[PDB]
Amino acid sequence: MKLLHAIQTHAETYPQTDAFRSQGQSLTYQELWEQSDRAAAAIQKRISGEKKSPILVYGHMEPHMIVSFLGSVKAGHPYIPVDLSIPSERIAKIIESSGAELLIHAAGLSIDAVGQQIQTVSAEELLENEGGSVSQDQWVKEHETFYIIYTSGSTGNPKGVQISAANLQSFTDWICADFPVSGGKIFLNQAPFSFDLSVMDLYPCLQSGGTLHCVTKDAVNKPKVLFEELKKSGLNVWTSTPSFVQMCLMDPGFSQDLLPHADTFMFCGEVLPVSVAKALLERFPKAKIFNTYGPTEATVAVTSVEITNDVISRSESLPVGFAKPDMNIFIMDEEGQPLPEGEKGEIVIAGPSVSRGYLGEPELTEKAFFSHEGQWAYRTGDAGFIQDGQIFCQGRLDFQIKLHGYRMELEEIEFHVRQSQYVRSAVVIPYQPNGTVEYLIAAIVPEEHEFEKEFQLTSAIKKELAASLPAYMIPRKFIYQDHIQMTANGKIDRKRIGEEVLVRSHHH
């Protein structure tokens, strides 16, 4: 059952049951469906249906975000979710490449808020449309793009992964059918909508007729209310990055007691530490844990495996799971061909979950996406192997990293740092003693300026980055040098620069 129809049916069958809860505000499947209907209609009066141009949906987790998502697709346009944490210049970059002709801000802005060169509408303004009613024939369908989520681009600009209705539905049916989330449960949502991890709970929840319970950035920044918010939620399904639950597990009060109704843990987006898995099993004895791996380029995740003490003892490195029933995953080699179980190669995903490609970026698509055996496939860039039928994920082949579950390209950061007038050269070092990156270091070969102190030159640069890079991509540490070790007749030697930098960290 197409996603939109299930939501439509829940709006008709049980129009009074909540579909979305976010900071005191609520929304029923009836309200969600009628408002989204109104939005779709108001949208078609502001942009041409000539082409399926993206519509940026701006905000955090207010009810209008979910309404606009549905309004966009019901109107036949894919939406680009944009979180408040994404800075002006990046947004401008996204607007630029996506060809978007409409940005909806879930609420009236503030003192110096929206300042973009694209049609702007508050969600409230749109919702003042009248009859506002599109017909099913308008809704995006089949291989038409449902949403485009942008992610870090190694060349310096973000790239938009296009996810079709078929992509999404394929993933959604998977979750609802193969996992204990059906029955109209309460799904937690901690991930901002601009990261597809959010999709793992958002759409499987709406299709299953459950209730989405958001936990905003605000609550997260206040440990007291965070837990307060959680206890009152009565959530059943917990979906988040391992890092987030690990921060919560940092408190003793976080256990079955806090979330008496918690029965399902959905993790994805980064390595799920064995320890974090053990604790969960101890503190939440009434809930099962699930581990799923996958890149944004393949619609959230394409594998899964229930974590049990039996699965924990059998390996000192938790597996990512077995392939999505309709997905094929291979372990290609440096040459481009397959590999037998046990060998270490690059994980390759082929199947209905794979994206058609990066928006407006053919050369980039061309390198990562390809037709294999007749089915669209994607080179994940991850290194792994398959043992006993289950994929094991270990490290990347390139310079893309994960910081606290945040995906970023070390080369996009270096690009921006080097794009400064004050900078002549730059290399970003991920401090990852164990394996998990704790923070980033920026080794910089400066340009003769006129500043006084160092946090002077360091502040001017960061202030710049703050404009084009989300906060989690701004290096924590800045150290300066005279020149960089460019090995391989040019390719700098990252390993050595790191060593030097850690040594310098000992000299106060």
Ligand SMILES: Nc1ncnc2c1ncn2[C@@H]1O[C@H](COP(=O)(O)O)[C@@H](O)[C@H]1O
């Ligand atoms: N379950 C997992 N275990 C280990 N690493 C993962 C897992 N899921 C995702 N990843 C990593 O995160 C990447 C996808 O990042 P993202 O597109 O931001 O969701 C994967 O290619 C891996 O590098």
